[PDB]
Amino acid sequence: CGIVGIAGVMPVNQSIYDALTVLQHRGQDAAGIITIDANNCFRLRKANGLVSDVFEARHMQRLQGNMGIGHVRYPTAGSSSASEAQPFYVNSPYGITLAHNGNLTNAHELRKKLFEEKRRHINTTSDSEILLNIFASELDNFRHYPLEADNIFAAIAATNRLIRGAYACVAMIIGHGMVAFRDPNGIRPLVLGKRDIDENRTEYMVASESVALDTLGFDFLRDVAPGEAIYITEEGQLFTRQCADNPVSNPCLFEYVYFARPDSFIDKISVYSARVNMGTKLGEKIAREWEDLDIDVVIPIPETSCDIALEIARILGKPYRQGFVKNRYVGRTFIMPGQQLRRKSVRRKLNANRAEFRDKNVLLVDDSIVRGTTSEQIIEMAREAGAKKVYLASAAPEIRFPNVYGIDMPSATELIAHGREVDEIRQIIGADGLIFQDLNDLIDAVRAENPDIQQFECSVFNGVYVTKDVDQGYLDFLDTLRNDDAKAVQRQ
Amino acid sequence: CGIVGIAGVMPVNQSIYDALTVLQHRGQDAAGIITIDANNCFRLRKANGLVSDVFEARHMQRLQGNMGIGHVRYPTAGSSSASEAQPFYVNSPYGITLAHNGNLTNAHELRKKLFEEKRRHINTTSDSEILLNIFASELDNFRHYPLEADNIFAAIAATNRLIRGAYACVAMIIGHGMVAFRDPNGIRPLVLGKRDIDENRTEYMVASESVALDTLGFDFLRDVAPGEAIYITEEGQLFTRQCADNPVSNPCLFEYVYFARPDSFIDKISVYSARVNMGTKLGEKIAREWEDLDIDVVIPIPETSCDIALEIARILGKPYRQGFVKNRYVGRTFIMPGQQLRRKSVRRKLNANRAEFRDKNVLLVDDSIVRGTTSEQIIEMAREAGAKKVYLASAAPEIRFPNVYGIDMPSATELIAHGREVDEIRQIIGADGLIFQDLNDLIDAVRAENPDIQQFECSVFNGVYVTKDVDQGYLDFLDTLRNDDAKAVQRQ
Amino acid sequence: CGIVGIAGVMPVNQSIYDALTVLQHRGQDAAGIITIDANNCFRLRKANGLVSDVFEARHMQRLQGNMGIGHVRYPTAGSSSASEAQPFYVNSPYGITLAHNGNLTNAHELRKKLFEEKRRHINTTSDSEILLNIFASELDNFRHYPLEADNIFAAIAATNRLIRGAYACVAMIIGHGMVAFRDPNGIRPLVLGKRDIDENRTEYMVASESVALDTLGFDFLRDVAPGEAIYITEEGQLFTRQCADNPVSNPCLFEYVYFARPDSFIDKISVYSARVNMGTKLGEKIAREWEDLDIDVVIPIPETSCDIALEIARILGKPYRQGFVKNRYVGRTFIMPGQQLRRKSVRRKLNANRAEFRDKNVLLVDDSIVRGTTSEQIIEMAREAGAKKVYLASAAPEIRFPNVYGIDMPSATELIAHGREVDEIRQIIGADGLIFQDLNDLIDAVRAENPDIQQFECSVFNGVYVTKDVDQGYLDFLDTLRNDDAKAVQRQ
Amino acid sequence: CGIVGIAGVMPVNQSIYDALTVLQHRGQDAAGIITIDANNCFRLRKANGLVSDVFEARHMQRLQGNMGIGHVRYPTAGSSSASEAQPFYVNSPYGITLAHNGNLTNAHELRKKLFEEKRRHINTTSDSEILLNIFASELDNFRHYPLEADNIFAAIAATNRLIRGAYACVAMIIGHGMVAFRDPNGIRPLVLGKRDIDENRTEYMVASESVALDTLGFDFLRDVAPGEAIYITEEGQLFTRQCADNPVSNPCLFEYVYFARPDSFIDKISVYSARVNMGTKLGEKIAREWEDLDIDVVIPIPETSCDIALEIARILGKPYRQGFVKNRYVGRTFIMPGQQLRRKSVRRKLNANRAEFRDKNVLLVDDSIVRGTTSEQIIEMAREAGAKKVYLASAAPEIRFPNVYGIDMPSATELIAHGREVDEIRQIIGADGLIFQDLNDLIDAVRAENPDIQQFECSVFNGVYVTKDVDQGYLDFLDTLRNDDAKAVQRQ
Ligand SMILES: O=P(O)(O)OC[C@H]1C[C@H](OP(=O)(O)OP(=O)(O)O)[C@H](O)[C@@H]1O
Ligand SMILES: O=P(O)(O)OC[C@H]1C[C@H](OP(=O)(O)OP(=O)(O)O)[C@H](O)[C@@H]1O
Ligand SMILES: *CC(=O)CC[C@H](N)C(=O)O
Ligand SMILES: *CC(=O)CC[C@H](N)C(=O)O
Ligand SMILES: *CC(=O)CC[C@H](N)C(=O)O
Ligand SMILES: [Mn+2]
Ligand SMILES: [Mn+2]
Ligand SMILES: [Mn+2]
Ligand SMILES: [Mn+2]
Ligand SMILES: [Mn+2]
Ligand SMILES: [Mn+2]
């Protein structure tokens, strides 16, 4: 999911629309934009679909104001109903709207809490709504008008104590300003930037990824430190504060492997370089373990793996060819909701340039293998076009565990690598060879960019969840609810 | 406007729909229904338009639960925007949704209060929204979870203490139940009824008029006493309490003159009888004041005046003839949003049976004349139809004052009787005679059915406003804010 | 169904909208408006729903031009799909659009013809589309540009030879003008009028009923003679001609009994007077056959029967009371598509003013009894409100045969009077007494207005179809297809 | 634009959808699919928007039949109105629906003709509609029911005799079958293919590009020869005939340069190879004309140029780096309707990986420069990204002439190369160098794949129009009628 916050001095609507467009790749299921207008009212527009379908001129005109927040959704909890599209809103205290990229591992627990203790009403099954509500009640502890930044920070500190999981949030509190914060583990991405308008008036903005800053002409300030909350007043005064007891930098690794745009710099790590470094480490592993292999061409599975593949072609000193033509009107299958929708998407998204495979042993390279969805079809395609032999290198290690921090992997059994050896997976997808990046490698691939990061968040790879609290019983519940069939039945 | 609220054991959506349909005459502008499903979640559906347009199968299937409220709107505050369609909802404390028929006379005073003081957010210009928030802020003064009936009532009384104006309201508090209250003056209509299901389960509903009970097969209980608050818990328990300091019954006289449906009984008064009664008084008045006149036929201006005219035709021993054909597909032109719309709607609404007027002295009868839209056009028609002489009789006294209790009449200058003597009004519409029911006759016509009512809310007639908080500055205020030009301008 | 044609000198769109509004009572299922603009292009807008829902300002603005035709649909053939909404259009020869009030009894036959012989393509199951196509092919016999009025007339004469049934049509032929014609039996209504704009420019218009002329300020010229076609050029030149070999005046009788608005004059017969005359004859029959009967009040079943009832009250010298309050947001149940929709409509459309029935023997009067739909519920209602005894007088004779001329009565078995004695019908609806108008009476009731009419079209009453060609095998097919269940299954 | 037509034994809707999806790059403005159901009725669904937006399950379930055609539009005539969305249909003779990819250069001449002469009605300003009507009017010259293959061909030849311009068309004649023809010059692409089902039933499809065959699992047959007409009957028979006087293959060169998808083979030419070939020629040109230059990296401007650039990077022995990230959710900015839309779309479409440009001399490569929209913005980005020197190379020759064959380039003044020497263009976009592929190189680059093609339709390049009916007055005409300001003005 992508969230954007802009506490500016001019109409932010097109700028947010534009921001969500570059972040569109983080959520294609719905999009929402909420602004505050001159009459301190919230102007909202959210619905299922792409940013380009969701907002029409008619909406844009209604979306007035100079401060606003937006969100593109990739459903990881609840349902695919437009009622779970973000932002969310609570009319008190003050009027708060919030966008969240993450996932609360203790949502059910906080739910009992909210009704019985806090007296708030959660109408959807979205954990982001819960989040906004935990925040809301915490904030509801400071009655004297007005809320002080210390109070806001104090509320988020309290929230940090209650909630568990991963979250990059952005919110607006009417008559107050824009608030943004990052979980105590720095799991989900969030960067702060600014655009100095004129000598004395500076606009600020937070976003999941820096590309949004770039595309809008905002300067990079830095990443919102883990556990740190930011607070920009309606008057333009920036406030900051560590709101976690033991803040630590454990960035999501999948963000580098696949999620983020290559042109973003997450925690001082150019996703682009990390991905190139991934190409280096993987091509090195291939050279070392597949040194006998006869390869005629190195073909990337668009779009994510390309540079990774490009680097691998260079390392192996083999040619890099765009054997697969991507349909520019089909999105990312992986972040699509249903497996059948994704499974089919793969055949409508890619088509071989037959000449590139005929009488050729090709090495197909992809950023990662998750459900197996892509690799399965891709290889057949490669074959049908005359590939003599097809090997597959994965820029990411086998993915054997559920993601509970903002990526839809609730069912381990849905992952192809689950309970399977590399060789079995190879046999399933029908590749002559299949090789996986080594975790320790991938880690250096990323770390090389910022050694300060000691440990990443890579549960989907090693099952060690940083927030600690994630256990087998939770994972069980989670699968019972979010497995593909349970989801389908919910889709009626 | 019309509100309904059903707390029962069966799904209420259809019942609420059918109720809104029979109360549709109270608000053709918008309709809303919100229910509580078994998950204790709100299911809402509200938008601009008639009940038949607003609700379709797709919507009905979504409106699950056995408890829900409904609303048909005739804007009297804010704007025509569907965002001000009702009901309104706030998620804390507990989750409350409310529908209001009336108008608060101290909105401005409360808007400022709600923010700086009670920390709530009002996103519209609707007083109904403000009203929900006072109840909420009052309700938010209790935390001993769960709310006891007493606290609800305590919030309502604290609410009445705060608000001024007319209001018949119904709401739902997630986890507690349905509540319904009436203003300390009993201006806006509200009745309670039940539907025993078995040995214990008895269904409860509230609605602006008893016709909604009739159609729904609900047993009539009584009018919700002025200032009373009704509270049906989720478990089915009915609690009532007087929440006004010194309540008094001052029913809106206009409900009888025109607003309500004749098959309704308001404050133990039958609108049908009250209307015939008006015709008796009007007939007797015509019999003495115009005695020396020659009338060939008595023609009602459909549809509200029909019975009145039938009865008048009775008094005078003259033929009642349905000289005017009303278009089944044109609603109440009176309650339409703009004067230009209403005017065009009158030629569409009615057409003359030339036979019934030619070479005859006709007596047109109408429940009332307000802006003079209908009468001005009706007379031109009678003439065109070959009518010798056209006389008009309004079952109602001259309307010279603005209504600030939930009836759209903000600008006294838009009322034809304003600044005019009967004869001036006669000349404008072009009648050869024009007679108005006297005020003391109207009141006696309605009281004849329930003498306990000592005084009626009849400010539109006598400029007397029971809430004693209405004044010239306030009236001028309304006039400016909502005059047809102000509204028409605002719509663009 | 209602059709309107206006060959005018100014924007006709609002005028047509207004025309369809007064004719709305002839078809509530869909509406369509097609104009010709300055660029001799057809501007069309048609869809299911009421005239008021179908056309929005956005449509109105697109509906430019000074010549146009409109239609309100009451489905009697095909399906209820918006694709069968009229007008219809064929791009050649010239560009022709047509609206039809009627029904072709030989549609299936003309269908084979059209493909094989005429080479035209019928895409819907509407006989009106077929009609337009038979016309189109006939017209396609005159190649030399341009078509002469003699040719147009000749085409319609040919059409009159081919097609069978009832039809009032209106069409526009691009670059040519507006054409209108009536079947050779004068079954369906159609009147011609005009509005002289300025010394030399006269606008013309045809319509199902004169009220449309009235409402628009058009002067009545006369009824389009049976078999006669009219042709108004784009230049304003009116042409006329008898286009049938044996033209005869056999007006639809149901039009007087129930279909048309009382304020219309069909074939020099004021529907209003015919209906009053119906009240006379029926009250006379009641006085003569129910002379012992003890009646306390005469109550009409709104809307159609009122004047009929009013007259009956006068004849019996009993009071006329509006015991039933009609919901002004529910239309005519009878012309509604499905029996369950109609059956229920009856309970949402009418509600007793209880006081009017309590301890009273009431005589309920309705224009007609068809399926029994209304009478059934009405009586229960009358009872539930305390009617001691309830009698029912029908302004129309028992209706025992299918209508194949423009009214949806394809299944005789759906008529309550089918194969039943008056007494059985009385027992079914549960009335203490039930009396039917005598055909011969009804005929004089109507004839009295225009003795020139020797014979009416009243097959639904006496099963003698004027077009002759209607036989049992056709009737059988017709029922197999249009019976309520076959229709329902078609509604999927 | 892209057209598809499938005559098969299975329902074609999904297949047509998937085909339109892979041909979506040929027209993002509108999409249309019309089928023939078992009742020999047309089922259409066309509207403005992408394939994914235009068609939803509701629509697909309605598009029944085994034969249907489809169309994805990029307006080049008329307006952007959905009424000019394709396919178009006429009901006589027999019922024909047609989809056209191209542009007729003698529209005006035919509009007058069709009315006064052939008595047909054109309701839009689309030449495709006019085209359908000529075929129709020609087809309407036969009456010996049914039409023999020969008559169809006879109508097509008579049609070609009448029309001028480029056109790849596909149509369906109710009761006969699918027909497809290509202009006498073979300008617009069209290929035929099949899908044998069993011993006899073989499915047939036509489509602007072979990729549509590939994705659909259809066997490639051949390109529809210039002037040829393909006719598949309803019973499955395939007839072909040359319907042009003196046909000749003059394929649209621009289809290879940019328009078509690389995995397509047009006129036995692979777009992928043609493009690499362009890169070889461009690479060799850069190698000689700029030899004394220092380039650090070669960066394609995604997405059309990618392979070209890869290959150029090959020629020069320089790194190919995906310096530019393209937004997956922004289509071909080139084919967007207005210059203001395209411009905003470029900043959205692309973003620079700062790493790849900083302190480097970059070589940007693009399939072409037309209005200069992309290049002007791309260069600013490279600079901003820290780039020392920014050089640009267009795989295509300077574009100085309007395309009148189905590519929106009406105003030569809107083409940057117009009235300019390379260097002037270099200065405008702000490159430190700008080189264009020579024309003779382009042609040789494409011909290298099918030397039989002697000449290409390349008027945009050399002002030479094979139809020899295009002239200055005609070009000036276009310019005036459709210049961005004319169009933008018209849209309002
Ligand atoms: O094994 P799977 O479950 O298919 O998951 C991994 C696939 C899917 C995803 O690609 P997309 O999200 O389809 O697209 P893109 O690479 O363009 O971001 C990812 O980059 C790998 O290719
Ligand atoms: O026996 P039935 O099949 O019910 O048919 C006859 C009824 C229905 C129809 O009334 P509506 O069409 O419902 O309404 P209105 O009288 O207002 O035109 C007609 O006037 C009789 O009342
Ligand atoms: C994409 C993402 O971060 C999910 C947000 C929240 N968990 C949800 O919408 O379920
Ligand atoms: C209402 C009417 O005349 C029907 C017209 C035609 N038969 C149809 O729509 O079926
Ligand atoms: C995209 C194309 O071929 C345009 C065809 C036709 N002229 C149109 O639809 O505008
Ligand atoms: Mn991928
Ligand atoms: Mn397999
Ligand atoms: Mn009235
Ligand atoms: Mn009736
Ligand atoms: Mn019964
Ligand atoms: Mn490009």
Token pair listed for C426 = 């009385």
Q: Is B479 annotated as a binding residue?
A: no
Q: Report yes or no: A169 and A180 within 8 Å, Cβ to Cβ.
A: yes
**Cβ C332 under 6 angstroms from ligand 2:** yes
- Cα–Cα distances (Å) from A482 to A338, A412, D148, in that order, read 11, 11, 60
Residue D311 has phi, psi (to 5 degrees) of -65, -40
For residue B310, give the nearest of C322, C347, C348 by CB distance: C322
CA distance D16 to D23: 10
Residue D430 CB partners (closer than 8 Å, separation 6+): D376, D379, D380, D383, D390
Q: Give the sign of the dihedral formed by CA D334, CA D335, CA D336, CA D337.
A: positive
Q: CB-based contacts of D20: which residues, under 8 Å, 6+ apart?
A: D2, D4, D31, D33, D51, D70, D71, D72
* Cis peptide upstream of residue D184 (ω within 30 degrees of 0): no
The answer to whether the beta carbons of residues A188 and A166 sit under 8 Å apart is yes
From residue D367, give the alpha-carbon distance in Å to each of B347, D345, D476.
Answer: 65, 18, 27
Which residue type, as a one-letter code, is found at position C252?
Answer: C
Q: Compute the distance between CA of residue A144 and CA of residue A131 in angstroms, rounded to an integer.
A: 23
- Which atom of ligand 4 is closest in space to residue C103's alpha carbon? 7
Q: Which residues of D touch C62 (CB under 8 A)?
A: none
What whole-number distance in Å separates Cα of residue D248 and Cα of residue D170?
20
| CA C52 – CA C41 distance, rounded (Å) | 24
Cα D47 from Cα D84, distance rounded (Å): 9
CA pseudo-torsion sign D158, D164, D168, D174: negative
The backbone torsions φ and ψ at residue A399, rounded to the nearest 5 degrees and listed phi first, read -110, 100
Cα(B328)–Cα(C60) distance, integer angstroms: 22
Alpha carbon of C49 to ligand 2 centroid (Å) = 20
Tokens linked to A480: 């019972």
- Separation in Å, CA of D263 to nearest CA in chain C: 39
Dmax over CA atoms of chain B, in Å, equals 77
Say whether C119 and D91 touch across the interface (CB within 8 A): no
Both tokens assigned to C205: 């218009």
Query: Could you tell me which chains touch chain A, where touching means 3 or more CB pairs under 8 A?
Result: B, D
C32 touches C99 (CB < 8 A) = yes
Dist. CA B86–CA B100, nearest whole Å? 8
Which residue carries 């029309």 as its tokens?
Answer: D163
The structure tokens listed for C16 are 């047509």
- Residue D34's DSSP bridge partners are D44, D69
> How is chain D split among helix, strand and coil, in percent rounded to 5?
35, 25, 40
Residues 6+ apart with CB under 8 A from C348: B18, B21, B22, B215, C327, C330
d(CA A302, CA A308): 11
Check the annotation: does A366 bind a ligand.
yes
In chain C, which residues have their Cβ closer than 8 Å to the Cβ of B18? 348
DSSP state of B337: S
Q: Do D234 and D177 touch, CB atoms closer than 8 A?
A: yes
Please give the structure tokens belonging to residue A44.
């909202």
Dist. CA A161–CA A143, nearest whole Å: 21
Tell me the best of C101, C188, C208 to mutate to test the pocket of ligand 4, counting ligand atoms within 8 Å of each CB and taking the most.
C101
Q: Report cis status (omega within 30 of 0) of the bond before A87.
A: yes
Chain centre distance of CA B116: 33
Q: List strand residue ranges (DSSP E) for B37-164, in order.
A: 42-48, 67-73, 88-90, 96-104
| Number of other CB atoms surrounding residue C490 within 10 Å | 14
Binning chain C into helix, strand and coil, the percentages to the nearest 5 are: 35, 25, 40
Residues of B in contact with C331 (CB under 8 A): 328-329
Tokens representing residue A438 in the block: 């080594």
| CA distances (Å), origin D347, targets A22, A27, C286, D379, D390 | 10, 20, 85, 11, 18
* B88 vs B94: CA distance, rounded Å: 14
Amino acid (one-letter) located at A64: Q
Neighbours of ion ligand 11 (CB under 5 A): D 304
d(CA A99, CA A108): 19
CA distance B266 to B275: 13
Experimental technique of record: X-ray
Residue with tokens 């098959």: B263
Q: Which atom of ligand 1 is nearest to the CA of A333?
A: 13
The domains found in chain D, sorted by start residue, are 1-275+401-411+446-492 (3.60.20.10), 276-326+349-400+412-445 (3.40.50.2020)
Q: How many residues belong to chain B? A: 492
Distance A356 CA to ligand 9 centre (A): 76
Binding-site residue ranges of C = 304, 366-367
User: Taking Cα atoms as reference points, which of C281, C241, C274, C238 lies closest to residue C257?
Assistant: C274
List, as own/partner pairs, every contact residues A80-84 make where C-beta atoms lie below 8 angstroms and the sequence separation is at least 24, other chains included. A80/A29, A80/A48, A80/A337, A80/A491, A81/A48, A81/A124, A82/A30, A82/A46, A82/A47, A82/A48, A83/A123, A83/A124, A84/A30, A84/A124, A84/A125, A84/A126, A84/A129
**Spatial CB neighbours of A310, under 8 Å, sequence gap ≥ 6:** A276, A279, A300, A320, D320, D321, D322
What is the SS3 assignment for B179? Answer: strand
The two structure tokens encoding residue C255: 């039009």
Atom of ligand 2 nearest to the CA of C373: 4
Cβ count near C447 (within 10 Å)? 17
**Cβ–Cβ < 8 Å for D296, D477:** no
Structure tokens at D306: 């990618």
CB-based contacts of A54, cutoff 8 Å, min separation 6: A30, A31, A32, A45, A46, A47, A48
- Rounded CA gap, D73 and D32, in Å? 8
The C-alpha atoms of residue C427 and residue C422 are separated, in whole angstroms, by: 9
Residue D320 DSSP symbol: B
Rounded CA separation C233/C150 (Å): 13
Rounded distance between C-alpha atoms, residue B387 and residue B374, angstroms:
17
Integer Cα distance of A312 and A330 in angstroms: 26
* Closest alpha carbon within chain B to A137: B92
- Resolution (in Å) of the shown entry? 2.4
Does the CB atom of residue D409 touch ligand 5 within 6 A? no
Is residue D50 within a helix (H) or strand (E), and if so which, with residue range? none
- The three-state secondary structure class of B12 is coil
Token pair 């993915």 is found at A399
Q: Please tell me what DSSP assigns to residue B126.
A: -
- Respond yes or no: is residue C169 known to be catalytic: no
Dihedral over alpha carbons A371, A374, A377, A378 (to 10 degrees)? -140
**What are the structure tokens assigned to A226, written together?**
């883990």
Any D CB within 8 A of A327 CB: yes
- Two tokens at B88? 């309104």
Cα–Cα distance measured from residue B72 to residue B4, given in angstroms and rounded to the nearest whole number: 9
Q: What is the largest CA-CA distance in chain C?
A: 77
Gap between the Cα atoms of B396 and B422, Å rounded: 13
Q: Which residues contact C421 (CB under 8 A, 6 or more apart)?
A: none
Residues of A serving a catalytic function are 1
Q: Strand A360-366 to strand A177-182: parallel, antiparallel, or no bridges (unpaired)? A: unpaired
Q: What is the DSSP letter of C358?
A: B
Phi-psi region of D469 (alpha: psi -120 to 50; beta: other; left: phi over 0): alpha
Of the listed ligands, the closest to the CA of D300 is 11
Q: What residues contact residue B291 under an 8 Å CB cut-off, 6+ apart?
A: none
Query: Beta partners for A389?
Result: A361
Give, in order, the Cα–Cα distances in Å from A370 to each of A253, A463, B454, C20.
14, 15, 78, 61
Which of D3, D29, D105, D126 should be mutated for ligand 5, with most atoms under 8 A from CB? D126
Sequence-separated (6 or more) residues with CB below 8 Å from residue A357: A299, A323, A382, A383, A385, A386, A387
**What is the rounded radius of gyration, in angstroms, for the C-alpha atoms of chain D?**
23
Name the residue among A271, A259, A274 with its Cα closest to residue A447: A274
Are A320 and D303 an interchain contact pair (Cβ–Cβ within 8 Å)?
A: no
What gap in Å lies between CA B205 and CA B197, rounded to an integer?
13
Residue B455 burial (10 A CB sphere; 0-12, 13-18, 19+)? middle
Which neighbouring-strand residues pair with D71? D3, D32
What is the phi/psi pair of residue B458, to 5°? -135, 30
CB C366 within 8 A of CB C282: no
User: Does the Cβ of D87 fall within 6 Å of ligand 5?
Assistant: no
Helix H or strand E segment including D294: none
Position of tokens 């050649």?
C92
Contact A211, A22 (CB under 8 A): yes
Q: Which of C84, C94, C22, C83 is nearest to C52 (CA)?
A: C22
Q: What is the DSSP string of B198-248?
A: SSS-EEEEEESSTHHHHHHTPEEEEEPPTTEEEEEETT--EEEEE-SSS--
- Centre of ligand 8 from the C-alpha of residue A247, in Å: 71
Residue of chain D nearest C113, judged by CA positions = D145
Between the CA of residue A378 and those of A392, A429, C294, C372, what are the distances in Å? Answer: 10, 9, 89, 67
CA dihedral B78→B84→B90→B91, nearest 10 degrees, is -150
Instruction: Transcribe A113-154 into DSSP letters.
Output: HIIIII-----SS-HHHHHHHHHHHHHTT--SSS--HHHHHH
Closest CA to D45 of D64, D32, D60, D36: D32
Query: In sequence order, what are the residues at sequence separation of 6 or more whose Cβ sits closer than 8 angstroms to the Cβ of residue A88?
Result: A97, A98, A99, A126, A128, A129, A132
Angstroms from A145 CA to nearest CA on chain B: 6
How many whole angstroms separate alpha carbon D74 and alpha carbon D406? 8
Count CB-CB contacts under 10 A for residue A327: 21
Nearest one of D335, B112, D179, D52 to A50, comparing CA atoms: D52
Which atom belonging to ligand 3 lies closest to the Cα atom of A406?
Answer: 3
CB-nearest to A272 from D261, D307, D355 is: D355
Kindly give the pairing relationship between strand B361-366 and strand B297-300: parallel
Q: Which tokens hold the place of B417?
A: 């009787």
| Contact in structure between A447 and A457 (CB atoms under 8 Å) | no
DSSP labels, D365-413: EES--SSSHHHHHHHHHHHHTTBSEEEEEESS----S-B-SSSSB--GG
Give burial (CB, 10 Å; 0-12/13-18/19+) of A287.
middle
Q: How far apart are the first and last CA of chain B?
A: 24
**Taking a C-beta distance cutoff of 8 angstroms, is the pair C55, C31 a contact?**
yes
Q: Is the CB of D76 under 6 A from ligand 5?
A: yes
The phi, psi pair for B404, rounded to 5°, reads -120, 25
Q: DSSP secondary structure string, C398-434?
A: ---S-B-SSSSB--GGGSTTTT--HHHHHHHHT-SEE
- Kindly give the pairing relationship between strand C238-242 and strand C67-73: unpaired
In 10 A of CB C295, how many CB atoms?
18
- Using the Cβ of B2 and the Cβ atoms of chain C, whether some distance falls under 8 Å is answered with no
**For residues A407 and A460, is the Cβ–Cβ distance under 8 A?**
yes
Which of these, D321, D436, D324, D328, lies nearest to D372 by C-alpha position? D436
Query: What DSSP designation does D147 have?
Result: P
Burial class (CB in 10 A: 0-12, 13-18, 19+), B343: middle
What is the distance in angstroms between the Cα of B173 and the nearest Cα belonging to chain A? 10
Q: Bridge-partner residues for C90, per DSSP?
A: C96
Distance CA D354, CA A263 (A): 8
Distances (CA, A) of B403 to B103, B281, B460, B475, B479: 9, 24, 6, 9, 11
State the Cα–Cα distance between residues B19 and B5, nearest whole angstrom.
Answer: 9
Pocket test for ligand 2, best of C334, C350, C368, C394 (most atoms within 8 A of CB): C334
Å between B387 CA and nearest CA of chain C: 16
Q: Is the peptide bond before C87 cis (omega within 30 degrees of 0)?
A: yes
Q: Is there a cis peptide before residue D87, judged by omega within 30 degrees of 0?
A: yes
**Taking a C-beta distance cutoff of 8 angstroms, is the pair A416, A369 a contact?**
yes
Q: How far from chain centre, in Å, is Cα A90? A: 25
